[PDB]
Each structure stands twice: as structure tokens, then as C-alpha cells.
Amino acid sequence: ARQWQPDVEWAEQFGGAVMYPTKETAHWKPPPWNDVDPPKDTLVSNLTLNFGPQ
Amino acid sequence: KFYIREPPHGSPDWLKVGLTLGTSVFLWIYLIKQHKEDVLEYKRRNGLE
Amino acid sequence: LLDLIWLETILPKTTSFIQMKMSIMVSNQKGLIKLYFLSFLITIMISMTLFNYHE
Amino acid sequence: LQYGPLAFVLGERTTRKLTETSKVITVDGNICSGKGRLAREIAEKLGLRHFPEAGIHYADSTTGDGKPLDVQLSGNCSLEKFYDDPKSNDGNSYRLQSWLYASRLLQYADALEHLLSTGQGVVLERSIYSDFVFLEAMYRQGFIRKQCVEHYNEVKKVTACEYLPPHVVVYVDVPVPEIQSRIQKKGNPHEMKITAAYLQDIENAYKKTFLPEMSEKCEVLQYSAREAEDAEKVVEDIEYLKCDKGPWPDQDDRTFHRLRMLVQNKLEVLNYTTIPVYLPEITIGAHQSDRVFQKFTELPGRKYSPGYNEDVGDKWIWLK
Amino acid sequence: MTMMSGRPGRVPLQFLPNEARSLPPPKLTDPRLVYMGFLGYCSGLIDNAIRRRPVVSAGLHRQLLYVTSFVFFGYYLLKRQDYMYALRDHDMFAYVKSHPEDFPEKDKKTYGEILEEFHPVR
Amino acid sequence: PTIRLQEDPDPEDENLYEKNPDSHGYDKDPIVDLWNMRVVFFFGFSIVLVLGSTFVAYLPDYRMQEWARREAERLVKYREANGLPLMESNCFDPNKIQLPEDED
Amino acid sequence: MNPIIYTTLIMTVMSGTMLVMISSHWLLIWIGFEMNLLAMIPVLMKNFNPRATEAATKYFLTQATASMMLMMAIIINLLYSGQWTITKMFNPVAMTMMTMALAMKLGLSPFHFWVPEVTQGISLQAGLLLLTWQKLAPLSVLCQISQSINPNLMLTMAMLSILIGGWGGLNQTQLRKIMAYSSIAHMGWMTAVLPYNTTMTILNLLIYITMTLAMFMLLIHSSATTTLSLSHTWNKMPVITSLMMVTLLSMGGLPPLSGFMPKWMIIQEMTKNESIIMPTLMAMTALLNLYFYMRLAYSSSLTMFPSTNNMKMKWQFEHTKQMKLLPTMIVLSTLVLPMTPALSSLN
Amino acid sequence: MPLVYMNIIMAFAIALAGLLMYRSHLMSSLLCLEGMMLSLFIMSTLIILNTHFTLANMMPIILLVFAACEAALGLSLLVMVSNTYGTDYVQNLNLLQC
Amino acid sequence: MLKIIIPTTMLLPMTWMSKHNMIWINATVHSLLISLISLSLLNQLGENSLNFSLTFFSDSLSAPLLVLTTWLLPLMLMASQSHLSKETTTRKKLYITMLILLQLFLIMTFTATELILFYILFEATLVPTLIIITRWGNQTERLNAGLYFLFYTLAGSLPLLVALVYIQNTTGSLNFLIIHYWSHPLSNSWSNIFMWLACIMAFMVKMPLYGLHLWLPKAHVEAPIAGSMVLAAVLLKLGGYGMMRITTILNPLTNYMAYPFLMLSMWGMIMTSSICLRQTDLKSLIAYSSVSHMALVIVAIMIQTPWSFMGATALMIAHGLTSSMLFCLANTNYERVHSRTMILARGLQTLLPLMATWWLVASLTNLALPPSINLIGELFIITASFSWSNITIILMGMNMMITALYSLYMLITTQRGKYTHHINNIKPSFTRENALMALHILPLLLLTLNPKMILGPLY
Ligand SMILES: CCCCCCCCCCCCCCCCCC(=O)OC[C@H](COP(=O)([O-])OCC(O)COP(=O)([O-])OC[C@@H](COC(=O)CCCCCCCCCCCCCCCCC)OC(=O)CCCCCCCCCCCCCCCCC)OC(=O)CCCCCCCCCCCCCCCCC
Ligand SMILES: CCCCCCCCCCCCCCCCC[C@@H](O)O[C@H](CO[C@H](O)CCCCCCCCCCCCCCC)COP(=O)(O)OCC[N+](C)(C)C
Ligand SMILES: CCCCCCCCCCCCCCCCC[C@@H](O)O[C@H](CO[C@H](O)CCCCCCCCCCCCCCC)COP(=O)(O)OCC[N+](C)(C)C
Ligand SMILES: CCCCCCCC/C=C\CCCCCCCC(=O)O[C@H](COC(=O)CCCCCCC/C=C/CCCCCCCC)COP(=O)(O)OCCN
Ligand SMILES: Nc1ncnc2c1ncn2[C@@H]1O[C@H](COP(=O)(O)OP(=O)(O)O)[C@@H](O)[C@H]1O
């Protein structure tokens, strides 16, 4: 009785990182909402030095 | 009725309105004068009148 | 057999299949500069050989 | 002139307006505790702008005329029906929580804009840093799903990172039985249905996540119920804080310029509240969206820009 | 391939040489100028529509400025285009005149002397 | 919620005969609908149809059919009286045609 | 970043472009390219995040390699003829080096891989700048050295650009990558007609710049960087999505819209020489760009996607910053075809 | 040309191939960039000295100047990259795809 | 002929300046007045065309098409206003604007003196139709239909443009008068063969030719009612008009080249008529019938005789009117029952007698009952084909049978039998629908009264 309009299932086709997903690109992720990736905890070890006894 | 200032008041910005209207009239006057001079100059060069 | 299958298979469906396959081929790059800078080297050598040597 | 790059290039600089009383203050506490009276008293004594707690219709009071609009065109959620049926199958609980978080974000933006434009301090009841406790109380009681919590966390992560935390966090501690007795004496028939488990969950959320983690940004002023009526003592305690440990002292003029451009232009503030994550509780179909938007545009002062609606007495439109 | 950049006597950034003054100027009622004014009016309407103002009535001074600016630019644009086409025709005719061997006017034959093949439709 | 989103239920179709038993099916406003019917009937049947057919029927003979008939009668009369053939196989005079010199 | 510093950097980028455009010495053109790149790098990193840093690094590596090849071509040309003026490029090897370097700078295929990545990694304003202003200088040099071009090499690269632009853009849900692939295809179109008529190149560049500016300004107006983000705009500003749909129609090349004017003229020009097959292939390939423009128009304007609750709050506020040149840009990008003969003013 | 000219052009080709083929480090590729600049300087200086183009004797110096800018630019970017990952590996610049 | 073009451009702001409840009245009245004005174009000469200016001219082939377009606009306005009642004012004005732009483009297309201007307008007709289909269609396949409507056209028309500009580099003009007067034969070479194909295949895909017709069932079924009316009535005739115009430069290459298209058209009319016999959707049947009739028109244009050209003109006008009437008839039932299945609603003659009379007249005119202009065009084409080769009477004859079958089949399925018991919402027919049917049908018989007005320039 009313015009068809897209629903959530239809709208989810365009929500991935790519169209036409393949086995290789099915593991790609869409970018974060703001273009800021989470900060990596890159352990930067401090240099350990012996001062003495000699 | 607005809860805020609504910087655009009931009266318009008279400075900007006057500037816009003045620019339009100056442009129209310049165009008319330029067309008149162009017609006269062409008539002189080709010797019609 | 004709209108719903074969006339569809030949003109529009073949075109869509080919375009989708080529799109997947073209846009499936990992984003590593190593690979396509190697491609740049190959392109430069091929262009120096095929077009530049024939003048 | 509107604030922007030109206003910052010549003249206007924020850091000169801060006169040791900028001091964003928030006063937290459980339900029915007297935090609002304490906030009003603190604002009155210190001469700061008081912001009443952001409700469902906070955004309506700041746009057009201050009169609230219909719940269908604004909010689309009910606190009373949340108390009556916390486990409604139409997703009212998380819709209310999400709308309240958005309203709190808008109120925080307004307070920050006022502070940065005038230099006068502001006092708030709750903030975006305090809202989550209610969400936790919803989750531990089974009122909302886990995906709702995930969506809330995403929106909070992308929104709350762009602002500064409050200078001083005031907490009012009231025991759960005393909260229940105050609710009983209040008389509102809907708050009578709040179980002690809900208030207990709110109290644990506060005392185990909010205060411990907000104590690292700045010192926390905790007051019992009895020592909250003496507002002058609380104010004089506030005047003797050494605030040199948070991000606020490490803010120079360019970051203030960026923050000032962010707090105005409320569309930029609210950008990430409507991210295209399709949860049933908050997703609306195209037909209802169209109907409600058409209904909203027919309000007396909403079809055009604020100064261009001749049906509410706007004159000289053809020269604006 | 640049045809007219190296043409002798060309002033680099003139946009309207003195020779163009020898041509009749476009009339103020030129339909191209009217179309340019229509473009200015459309720009004004879209400006009203984007800013959420009454499209037809919001700013009459702004719409007037839009129309005037479009007409003002279009007048000189038309002048330069007419000048360029006149230059092209002048150069073409001069080159044809100066190279008679390349453009021979051969004998004209009547249709009573040319044999055309007939292809029946059947 | 076991649902996917919030949507309005599909509304039922409105019957124009419910509020206006003589509705004409043009509009829900009775006066506007009546005048829509009136203008459609007047300008479709009375103006365009009948007057247009009358105008087309009496279109003057620019296709030159009666002229061609009279010219044919004149030519036939002259050719029959003078004994000439009614039609010639050549529509162009051969005196004005120059065939190629050699056909071998 | 300070507003004064940002203004200075934008002026330096523009000054490098004009230095390329007004110079008669090869060294000064190379210097203009150098200055433009040096000032352009921080503009890409204006909003700091790892993605912007990666995009800036890739852009720098590509442009530095291209500039080094440009310098090598200039030096070889000087070796075989002691000429510094930008002219008919007396050596063919130097000309091949120049063509490849300028193609790498422009993003022409197969030196195209950096364009989608850089456009995706930066903001919409930086993408606008990169996809509109950064095309002028290499195209100006190519127009200047057009007489000595090897038609086979540039025609190959132009056809590859059109094909790869269509195929790559077919697969994208990110708006910036769609814009980048459209840019690659239009670059191919502009470079296909260069050996035959530079006026057509200039006309195509101007129309593409107008259309791209209108598109990017509409994308900035409604804060959308994805298809799903843009599918919400109808519930907030329907006029914006309508103008977006007409702009996409124009960019698709459909008559009577202005986007039809360049291709049409280019095709005509290529038939004034013999060149029949190439325009046919180019149009058949541009049908792909039309397809993914149409898919975007389906998603944003011709259908209504589901929305969210919090959108209601956005109904109560307005756009503070207003772009003054948006209406004129939209009008020029749609209703300009009847003024086609005015292109004679370009030569 | 003499043997020196082909030697210089061969060095330029080697440096270009070295830049185009990445191994792991960004610093190695930056070094290849500086190598290309050095080869260009040498070649231009030889061509200018051989033909006694007096006013062109200043062009190589100008070249060096802009070379420095490029080098500085690259180093700046390198620092930022390292600050994100703790290494200067080009394998980590893979957040953006085609 | 600006006296017809300007009033439509004035229809635009009148629609956009009208009150919210007076748009339909104003649009209908002034469209009817414009049709009355355009009626003056029928006064044609016997030797040359009416050359109005350097840009526009009227021939005996284009004047009936212009009249048909200007007459169709008010009919689409009347048909559309029923299903757009709940639509907002702005969207209704946008729909009317799309219809007005389509009519303006068609009017300017049918009178352009140059071939390139004709191309530009004949391609500009695409945008409003696509917008109408993909925005105001009802189901979800409409989007797909739009794509099929678009690229199928462009893949055919992009080569033509190339050919067109090539011709202007060889002869120096694309003006149809100069092209006709300075015509030269086409040699038998591969270049000329591909020039022929480039000039012809765009119009072939527009008709459409059998095998290239897959876009048409989708587009005509998924479109709204006004879209279907304009698609079947006028937009198909652009291909025929363009082919009749462009064939003047393709001789004598046409005799060798036409064979595959002739065989495709004849076997395809047979195949599409057969397809109409087993169709569960009512709109798809009408679409395939349109394909069959247009195949007949393709044969008529391709054999290239005067009688064939008169038959093509008459058949094009008759088919336009008949197909528009049939689509409106189907849409009435669809609006009643919200479904397109043909066996869902049966025995409608019991409930709607006058509507059944309209159905009968439309089905009678579809099967070319004499002396309707449908039969005149069909018989002229058949006679020309018989002169071309006596064996064609077989295939054409078979068509004349199958057509009638499916036509009557449609009627018998919808109007006769017993009504469906559970369908209890068949309201009486409105005055609007009956008036729409009458305004469709009366001009057909009036044209039969004077047939030389639609027989084209070869008369
Ligand atoms: C070729 C021959 C000549 C023709 C030239 C080409 C066409 C004309 C030029 C085009 C530009 C002109 C208008 C531009 C601004 C339009 C923007 C707009 O929104 O308009 C709304 C506006 C109404 O808004 P409002 O009054 O403020 O209150 C209602 C609210 O705004 C309520 O608004 P809302 O925002 O709430 O509603 C939302 C709605 C709003 O969305 C829209 O309104 C869409 C408008 C997009 C504008 C077109 C894009 C840019 C131009 C390209 C045109 C392409 C043409 C080529 C063919 C391809 C077709 C696409 O969006 C939707 O609902 C989505 C529906 C999806 C439909 C998709 C189809 C859209 C494309 C259609 C384009 C057709 C051409 C333009 C026709 C005029 C449109 C008004 O319309 C108008 O009132 C102005 C139009 C008429 C003004 C001119 C009349 C002059 C005075 C009369 C006297 C005449 C003088 C005669 C001289 C002699 C003396 C007697
Ligand atoms: C999609 C619409 C595209 C429009 C593009 C923008 C329109 C507004 C821009 C205004 C242009 C400002 C120029 C006027 C200032 C005077 C500068 C003048 O001296 O420039 C001269 C030249 O004048 C300009 O070139 C003319 C610019 C006019 C652009 C309009 C043509 C667009 C084609 C038709 C589209 C319809 C236009 C509609 C207008 C609204 C220099 O000649 P020259 O130094 O020797 O040529 C350099 C290039 N060469 C040597 C390689 C040949
Ligand atoms: C509901 C109940 C119905 C039954 C009762 C009906 C009562 C009787 C009414 C029926 C009338 C019977 C018709 C019998 C024929 C008489 C009329 C005929 O003689 O006139 C013809 C004339 O008819 C007209 O020429 C045909 C009408 C024109 C049709 C144009 C349609 C109107 C435009 C609407 C839009 C069209 C869209 C389609 C585009 C092509 C003669 O043509 P012609 O030999 O010359 O005249 C010679 C003398 N002249 C030339 C001096 C005039
Ligand atoms: C949905 C279906 C629509 C798709 C149909 C599209 C196919 C249209 C037919 C092909 C058109 C290509 C011709 C383009 C214009 C030719 C104009 C011309 O006359 O050029 C010829 C040259 O002719 C050509 O170059 C044409 C070559 C073909 C190149 C493109 C091939 C396209 C596909 C060919 C097979 C398709 C067959 C028709 C489609 C069948 C249906 C699927 C003369 O040029 P000169 O070089 O000067 O010759 C004289 C001096 N030597
Ligand atoms: N984020 C929220 N979630 C659920 N309920 C809330 C939220 N914020 C405020 N409320 C409700 O507001 C009501 C009163 O608020 P409160 O501030 O505690 O009292 P008062 O107005 O006296 O200061 C309480 O019933 C509380 O549940």
C-alpha cells in the first residue's frame, strides 16, 4: 500500500570496507568513525646501564 | 520569540544592503557606458556614420 | 530459455560479471609501497624499451 | 563578528580571559541526593553560571524559543515509562540513555563555549564523564543488551576525547536506605518502583569506576550527606585546592582556539552521535523518519532559519 | 597542439586587443546575455535554498547582484569569443588568398553531364 | 526487541466516497475537486476536441491536391486533342543530357 | 596549527604552482615543483593521526621520485642541446623521461596507486586541494611541450587511466576513494586530447575543477565520508542531496548537463584527425564512472535509508560556516552547455 | 659521450632502482634519494664545465639547496612514523589500500 | 516554433508559483491550451517542410508526433494525481516539473534541423524518465530497472555521436536539408559497414529491436503510471523517427546491411507475441505487445518504400495512443487491488461495466480492427513487405493471429468469469478514470475519420 524503501538489511550492503567482498578482503575492516586508529602499545625499552663498581 | 540573540535582527544590515545595491547600480551604469562607447568606436572605425 | 536466461546471459550479465571481476582485480591492493614501487620500476623499464627505443 | 581564524589572527586570545575562577565544577551523587541544591549554592557563592541537569528537552530550551517540544519530535523516549517498564521490548531504556548522553554532550559544549567566550566559571550537575554509571546500572539489571553498551562505548570514545575534564569533581555520598526513604517521602509514584539493586549498582559504579579514575585527572571533593548542607564550608574548601595536575594547565592558546571552534557549531559536536550503527533500539525506518521530519518542519518557528520565519513576526525578510 | 598562441602581434595577457574594437559589440538584448542573467538568477535561488531561506523572496539585493555579475562577465566573454572567431576567419581567408595553388577553383559541371550510378530500391 | 528498527505500520487506503458520496475522484476538497472536473471536461472535450476537429477538418488545401487535379485535366485535354502521348517515358529533355562519348 | 602558518603554507603552494606556470627556464619549473611539494606536505597532516602520516609519507616518496626523474630529463636535454628554455625537447629519451615523470606527478596509470590511498588518508579539505589545485602545474608543462610528445605513450597511459579509474571506482564504499578514481579517469580524458588540441585540455580541466569543487564542498557541508554516512543526509538537508544528485548526473557526462561538453568536444577533435577507435573506447569505458555515480545517487538521493533517533537533535541546529561559492559552482557544473562556443575565448 | 658520462648515468640508474626496490628500512630509501641527487649534481656540473656555460655554474648549488629540503622533509616524516610504531619499517604503512 | 516552446517553459514557474491545492488544475488547463495551440502544425505542404528558422523546422512526419506529445501531457497529469495524494507539495511540484521538462525536450527533439542538436535532446530525454522511475516507482526492482533503462540506451547511442561528428568532418554539415540535397552513395567497405552500424544501432536499441529489448519490460513494469504512458507512447517513437531521418545517407548499403535486423524483427515479433500468451503480470503483457508492434515498425523502416513509411507513421501514432490507454486501464485495477497478478481479480465486468467497455475498445484497437489507423498502418506495412518478398506474408500472418489471441485473452481473464469472492473493496469508477479513458479513445476514431494527417511526408 506504500512505496518500498530500504531497510537495515539493504543498507548493510554498503557498510563494509569494500563492495564485492572476496576471501582476501572479507577480513578488511572499515576505518574508524574519526580517522584515528587506537594508539599501539609499542614497548620502547629504556637502556639499562651499570654505573660502577669499577 | 527566539531564546537567543539571533544576531540577524528585525531590521536588515543596512551597510551590507547599501553596499550590494550600490555595487549593482555601479556595474549596470558601467556596462551601459561601455556599450555606448563600443558602438560609437565601431561606427567610427568602420565609417558608417 | 531465451528471454530470461540466454539473452540475459550474453549481453548484460556477461558485462556485469566481467566488470565486477576486473574491479576486484584492480582494487585489491594491500597498500604496501614495496609492491607498486616495484611495479613502477617495471613500467619505467618497459616504457624505456618499447616506446623510447622506437623513435 | 563570528569567532574564527580571523578573530584569532588579530586580537582575540582566550588565555588572557582566564582569571583563576574558570574552574569547571561538576557535583555528582546518587539519585534523590541533594546535589542540585549544593550546585546552586556553589554557583551563587563563587559567582559562576549554574547549569541545571540536562533532561530530555534540554536542546529545546536552547534553540528557537525555550519552550519544550512534543516528545515525538524531540527525544522519543520517556523516563516515567522507563520506571514503569524497564524491560520494555521497544528499546525505550537504551534510547533514553543515548538521548540523555547526547543532551549531556550538548550541555557540556554550551558550558565550555560560555567559559571560553566570557571567562566566567560554570557549575554542572552531571557530565559526559558521569553518565556511564547509569548505563552500567542498566546492564547489571538486564535492562539493556550488550550491543547497546558497545554502541555507547563507541560514541563515548569518539566524542569525549575532544574536550577537557572538569577542574574539580564534587561528590555527595548518601546511603542507599536513605535514598529509598527520600524517594518514599518525595511522593512521585514512578520513582517508588526503583529497586534497591538499581541504586546499589549506581553506587558501586560511582565508587569503583568514576571517582577512582577521576581522581587521577584532578582531586575529588567527597562530602557526606550531613556535611553537604553547609555550602559555605564546601565553597571555602573549593577555594583552597592546588590544581596543577590535570590537562588544564598544559593548554596553550592554539588548543584553546581549536576547542573554541569545536564548542560552537553544535552540529560538529553532535556529528558522531548519529553514526550508522543499526541497533533496533535507536534505528528508525524511512517512513517514520519522513513523517516525523515533515511534522517537525511545520512547527511555527522551524521551517526556515531563525531570522527568516515571517509567521512568528519576522520583518524586512526581503532585505536580509 | 596550440593554434593561436604563437600568432604574431599577440599581447600576452590582454584579453581584448585594440583590433577587437573594430567589430560590432554584442547587443544588450543578446540571448546569450539573457542566458547568463538566467544563470545568475539560478545561482541566487540556489543560494537562498541552501541557507534555508524563502527561495523566491529572501534576498532581492543578493539576487540582483548575482544577475548583474553574471551579465557583466558574459558581455566581455562574448566580446572576446566574437573577436577570436573573427580572427580565425580573417586568417583562413588570407591564407586561401595567398596560396592559390592549394585551393583551385575547378570547372563546374551541370548535372546533365555527370554520370551518377542508379541503385534501385526493390 | 526481536525487531530490526522503529517503523510506522502500513496505513490503510482512504476511500474518497466515504466523506464525499459524489466525489469525482479528483481531490479530497469537494469544491476543488468539482472545479477540477469542470475544467478538465470543458477544456478537454469542449475546447480542444470539438473545436480542434473542426479546425483540422477545414484546413486549407496547401497539399495542392485540387491544383494538381486541375493541372492534370488541362494537360490531358491538350495532349488528347493534339494527339500527343498522355505521358512520356522521359521526364527530362534528352537535348539537355550529354551521355558519355564512348561506351566500349 | 596556527591560522597564520596555514595561510602561509597555502600561499606557498599556490606560489609554487604559479612559478611553474610563468617560468621560461627548466630550473625554475623544477624549483616551483619542489616548493609546491615542500609546502603541500604539512597541509596533508593538518589534523594529526597515523593515517594522515602514512598518506603524507606515500605522497612525499612518489613526488620525490617524480621530481628526480624530471631533473634527470632536463639534464639529458641540456646535454644533447645546451638549451634551458621549455621548448620542443630536442632529445627523445629525455622526452620519455619527462612524460613518465609528469604522469607520475599527475597520478596517471600505471603510476596511479598512490592517489586513492592519499585521498583516503587525509581530510576533505586537503583532498579538495590535492584533487583540484595539484593538477595545474604538470598539465601546464605538458601543454607547453605538447609538440614533441610521443602520441603512443600518452595515449596508452590515458586509456589505462580511464580503464583503471572506472574499474577501481566500481568497488568503493568510501567517498574519498570514489573521488580519487574519478580524478584518475578525468586525468586520462584530459591527457588523451593533449597531442591534438591543448584548448580542449584546458576546457576539460576547467569543467572538471568546477565539478570537483562543487562535489567536495557538498561533501564538506554534510559531514559524510562514507556511503552510509551520506545516506543520513536526506533526513537533515534534502536540498543538499538533491543538488548532489544533479552534480553526480553532470559528472557522469549525461546531456544536457555541462559534464557532457568536454567529452563531446574531445571526441569531435579526435575525429578531425582520423582517430576513430580511441574515442569510442573512451566513451564505452566512461560508462563505468557513470555507473558508480548512479549507485551513489541511488544511495543518497533517489531512495530514503533508515535513520537514527539522535538525528532529531540535529534538526534543531543550523550550519554555521557557509561556503559562499557553492551555489555558483553548482550552477556552473550543471547549466553551462548552451554557452559551449565561448570556449573559443580559451585559445 | 665519454666513459664518465655513462658511468654517472649508470650510477643514477642504480640509485633509482635502489629506491624503487624497498627492503625494510625507510632510511635506506632516503639514502637512495640522496644518491640520486648527488648523481644529478655531478652530471650537471660536468655538462656545465665542459661547455663553459658561465652563468649556469650556479645551477648545481641551487640544486643542492632543494636537495637538503627533501632530505629534511623525509627525516621529519621518518620521526613521526617511528613514534607511531617504534620502528621505521615500511611494512607498517599499510592502513590505506587501493 | 517558439510559440509552442515558450508556453511550456512558462508552465514551469506557473507550477512552482501555484497554491498547494491548485497545481493539478492549472497544469491540466494550460497543457490542454498548449495542445490546442500545437494543433496548428498539421497544416503541412506537399513539397517541402515548414522551415521556421535556421534551428527549427516542421515536417509532415514530426507534426503528428508533436501533437501526440502535447496531448499526452494532460493525460499523464490526470493519471498521476491519484497515487500522489499523500505526497508533500514540494515533491508533487517536482514530479510535475519532471513531466514538463520531458515534454519540452521531446518538443525540441522532434523539430531540430541539425542531427547533433537532435542527438543532444534525444539523450537529454533520459534524465527525467530515469528520475521518475527510480524515485516514484513502487517496488524495489525499480532501481535495477533504471540501470537497465540507462546503459542499454547509452551503449547504443555513444557510437552514434562519434559517427555524427565524423560525418560533419566529411560533408561539412549536419543540417537535414543540406544532408538530403547533397546526398552521396555509400560504398561497400568495412569502414562504411561500421559507419552504418554506428548510425543505426542507437535507434535500434530505442525501438527496441528483438534481442536488445530486455530493458523495456523492466522499465515499463517498474515505472509509475505517467512514466509508463510516456515510455510507451512517445519515447519508443524517437528511434523510428531517427531511423527514418538517418536512412537518407545510408543508401545503397542498406540493402545488404538490413537482412539480420529484418530476420530479427520478424522472428522477434513472433516470439514476443508468443511470450504474451503466458504472462502472469498484466503490465509485462502490454510491454511485450509494444515490442511486437515496434518490430513491425522496424521492418517497415528497413525495407525503405513509400508505402512502408506511411505504414510506419500511422502505426507509430496508433500504438502510442493504444499503449497509453492500456497502461492506464491496468493501473486502475492495480490501484484498486494493489497487485499486478492477472488472475487475482476476475469478473470485473460484473462490478465495473463502463470500465469493461473501455477495456473492450482498447483490446479491439490493439488487435487492429478495421478501419482503425492501427489496421491502416499494419496493412500498409504488410503490403510493402509482400512487395519486398512474397514469403513474408507467412510470418506477418502468424503475428496477426497470435496478437488477437493474447489481446482477447487479457480481456477474458480480467472482465469475464466470476468475481473473486474475498476481494470486497472494488469501489465504483471515478469520473477522472472514465474521462481519462475517453480522452484516450476519442482521438483515435477521429483520426480514422481523416487518415492523411498521420500518414507522413510520403503521402
Ligand atoms: C530547459 C529550459 C529552461 C529550464 C532550465 C532548467 C531548470 C530551471 C533552472 C534550475 C535552477 C532553478 C531553481 C534552483 C533552486 C531550487 C532549489 C529548491 O529547493 O527549490 C525549492 C523552492 C520552494 O521552496 P520554498 O518556497 O522556500 O518553501 C518550500 C520548502 O523549501 C520545502 O523544501 P524542502 O527542502 O523541505 O523539500 C525537500 C526537497 C527539495 O529538493 C528540491 O527542491 C530539488 C531542487 C534541486 C534544484 C535543481 C539542481 C540544480 C539545477 C539543475 C537543473 C537540471 C536541468 C536539466 C534537466 C535534468 C533534470 C534534473 O527535496 C526532496 O523532496 C527530494 C525529492 C527527490 C526528487 C529529485 C529531483 C530533483 C532534481 C530536479 C531538478 C529540475 C530542475 C529545477 C526545477 C525547479 C526546482 C525548484 O522552489 C521555488 O519556489 C523556486 C522555483 C521557481 C522560481 C522561479 C520563478 C520566477 C518567478 C515566477 C515568474 C516567472 C517570470 C517569467 C518572465 C516573464 C514575466 C511574465
Ligand atoms: C563549467 C564552467 C567553467 C567556467 C570557468 C570559471 C569561470 C570564471 C573565471 C574567470 C576568468 C578570469 C579571466 C579574466 C581576467 C583577464 C585575464 C586574461 O588576460 O587572460 C587571457 C586569456 O583569457 C582567458 O583565457 C579566458 C577565460 C574565460 C573562461 C571561460 C571559457 C569556458 C568555456 C565555455 C563554458 C561556458 C562559460 C560560462 C561563464 C559563466 C590571457 O591570454 P593568454 O595569456 O594569451 O592565454 C594563456 C594560455 N595560453 C597561452 C596557453 C593560450
Ligand atoms: C455515447 C453515445 C455514442 C453514440 C451516439 C453518437 C451520435 C452521432 C455522433 C457520431 C458522428 C458520426 C461520424 C460520421 C462522419 C461525419 C463527419 C465527417 O464527415 O467529417 C470528416 C472530417 O473529420 C475531420 O477531418 C477529422 C477530425 C480531426 C481529428 C483530430 C483530433 C483532435 C486533436 C486532439 C489531440 C490528438 C492526439 C493524437 C495526435 C495525432 C470529413 O472529412 P473531409 O473529407 O476532409 O471533409 C470534406 C469537406 N471539408 C474538407 C470541407 C471539411
Ligand atoms: C546494448 C547494445 C548496444 C551496443 C551496440 C554498440 C555497437 C555499435 C557498432 C560499432 C560502432 C563503431 C564505429 C564507430 C564510428 C565509425 C565511423 C567511421 O566511419 O569510421 C570508419 C572506421 O571504422 C572503424 O574504425 C570502426 C572499427 C570498430 C572499432 C570499435 C569496435 C566496437 C565493437 C565492434 C563489434 C560490434 C558489432 C555491433 C554490436 C553487435 C551487438 C552486440 C572510417 O574511418 P577511417 O579510418 O577514416 O577509414 C577510411 C580511411 N581508412
Ligand atoms: N542518565 C540517566 N539515566 C537514567 N535516569 C536518569 C539519568 N539522569 C537523571 N536521571 C533521573 O533523573 C531523576 C532525578 O534526578 P536527580 O538529579 O537524581 O534528582 P534532583 O533533581 O533532585 O537533583 C531521577 O529519577 C534519575 O533517575
UniProtKB/Swiss-Prot annotation, chain G:
Keywords: Electron transport, Membrane, Mitochondrion, Mitochondrion inner membrane, NAD, Respiratory chain, Translocase, Transmembrane, Transmembrane helix, Transport, Ubiquinone. It comes from the Eukaryota. The chain crosses the membrane at residues 3-23, 25-45, 59-79, 89-109, 149-169, 178-198, 200-220, 237-257, 274-294, 325-345. Its EC number is 7.1.1.2. The keyword Glycosyltransferase does not apply. It is a multi-pass membrane protein. One of its GO terms (molecular function) is NADH dehydrogenase (ubiquinone) activity. One of its GO terms (cellular component) is mitochondrial inner membrane. It is found in: Mitochondrion inner membrane. It catalyses: a ubiquinone + NADH + 5 H(+)(in) = a ubiquinol + NAD(+) + 4 H(+)(out). InterPro entries: Complex_I_Subunit_2 (IPR050175), NADH_DH_su2_C (IPR010933), NADH_UbQ_OxRdtase_chain2 (IPR003917), ND/Mrp_TM (IPR001750). GO terms for biological process: mitochondrial electron transport, NADH to ubiquinone; mitochondrial respiratory chain complex I assembly; reactive oxygen species metabolic process. Core subunit of the mitochondrial membrane respiratory chain NADH dehydrogenase (Complex I) which catalyzes electron transfer from NADH through the respiratory chain, using ubiquinone as an electron acceptor. Essential for the catalytic activity and assembly of complex I. Core subunit of respiratory chain NADH dehydrogenase (Complex I) which is composed of 45 different subunits. Interacts with TMEM242. Belongs to the complex I subunit 2 family. This is NADH-ubiquinone oxidoreductase chain 2. It comes from Sus scrofa (Pig). The gene is MT-ND2.
UniProtKB/Swiss-Prot annotation, chain H:
InterPro entries: NADH_UbQ_OxRdtase_chain4L/K, NUOK/Mnh_C1-like. It is a multi-pass membrane protein. Its main location: mitochondrion. GO terms for molecular function: NADH dehydrogenase (ubiquinone) activity. The chain crosses the membrane at residues 1-21, 29-49, 61-81. Keywords: Electron transport, Membrane, Mitochondrion, Mitochondrion inner membrane, NAD, Respiratory chain, Translocase, Transmembrane, Transmembrane helix, Transport, Ubiquinone. It catalyses: a ubiquinone + NADH + 5 H(+)(in) = a ubiquinol + NAD(+) + 4 H(+)(out). It comes from the Eukaryota. Its EC number is 7.1.1.2. It is found in: Mitochondrion inner membrane. One of its GO terms (cellular component) is respiratory chain complex I. One of its GO terms (biological process) is ATP synthesis coupled electron transport. Pfam families: Oxidored_q2. Core subunit of respiratory chain NADH dehydrogenase (Complex I) which is composed of 45 different subunits. Belongs to the complex I subunit 4L family. Core subunit of the mitochondrial membrane respiratory chain NADH dehydrogenase (Complex I) which catalyzes electron transfer from NADH through the respiratory chain, using ubiquinone as an electron acceptor. Part of the enzyme membrane arm which is embedded in the lipid bilayer and involved in proton translocation. This is NADH-ubiquinone oxidoreductase chain 4L. It comes from Sus scrofa.
